Amino acid sequence: LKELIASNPDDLTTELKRAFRPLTPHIAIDGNELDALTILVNLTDKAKCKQKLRDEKWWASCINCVNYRQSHNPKFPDIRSEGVIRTQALGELPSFLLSSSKIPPYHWSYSHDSKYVNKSAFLTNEFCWDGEISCLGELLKDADHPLWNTLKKLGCSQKTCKAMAKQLADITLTTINVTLAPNYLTQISLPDSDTSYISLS
RNA sequence: CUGAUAACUUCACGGCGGGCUUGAUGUCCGCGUCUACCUGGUGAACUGCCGAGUAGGUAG
Numbered sequence: 001l002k003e004l005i006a007s008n009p010d011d012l013t014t015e016l017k018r019a020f021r022p023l024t025p026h027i028a029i030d031g032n033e034l035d036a037l038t039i040l041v042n043l044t045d046k047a048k049c050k051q052k053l054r055d056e057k058w059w060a061s062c063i064n065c066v067n068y069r070q071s072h073n074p075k076f077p078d079i080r081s082e083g084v085i086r087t088q089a090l091g092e093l094p095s096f097l098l099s100s101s102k103i104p105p106y107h108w109s110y111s112h113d114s115k116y117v118n119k120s121a122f123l124t125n126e127f128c129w130d131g132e133i134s135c136l137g138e139l140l141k142d143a144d145h146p147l148w149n150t151l152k153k154l155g156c157s158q159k160t161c162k163a164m165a166k167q168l169a170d171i172t173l174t175t176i177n178v179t180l181a182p183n184y185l186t187q188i189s190l191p192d193s194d195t196s197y198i199s200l201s
Numbered sequence: 202c203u204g205a206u207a208a209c210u211u212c213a214c215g216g217c218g219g220g221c222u223u224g225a226u227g228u229c230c231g232c233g234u235c236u237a238c239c240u241g242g243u244g245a246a247c248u249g250c251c252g253a254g255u256a257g258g259u260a261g
Binding site for chain 2: 188197
């Protein structure tokens, strides 16, 4: 919760880059808003000056990263492991069993390949607009949404590139897609009673 | 029916040079240890003989 206090203490550039990457406490983009959304649209290459990253087929590489957001990481710890898993805990746990039902689930991150790491900006970072701690890509998938005339603060995005952001991101955030063969996933089997056995990965 | 099933981290190596802990010093004064104590071998292994013999031998 260090939004403008951490914006200009005159340290260095990458204080913000350490602050959006989800291994840190969040910030809350409420007061100074257009100067922060010009950062995430400029975190793709590795303000308002290094443009032509706005209203092009840039969005074709920008839309492909929202499918791969990975609640759970199927590549841990072996590298070659294809899979997409995004589902919460499915139930509840008692008082003395620590798991990820006991902490809230808001640090999910792109894990597909090497090239699209920087181009997975602008829709996979989390910025706490006024209430909700929320991302940027699970918000711009509807029409009647604020901080979207601030997309028109930049006089570049025509309202036919708005017409794709209407209907591209429609139903995505519940899937599980792993195929057990041929794959490098681990799996075991355990008894559920003295009659059958349940496999689990 | 085990975060399941399989798995060689390896090769080479100079820590070295030099060096003054010193000067001075009063532990002293006094002092009652004492009283009382059963160790218990019955008669029991006795008497000659040779040799000058507190040595040596020898009898039943």
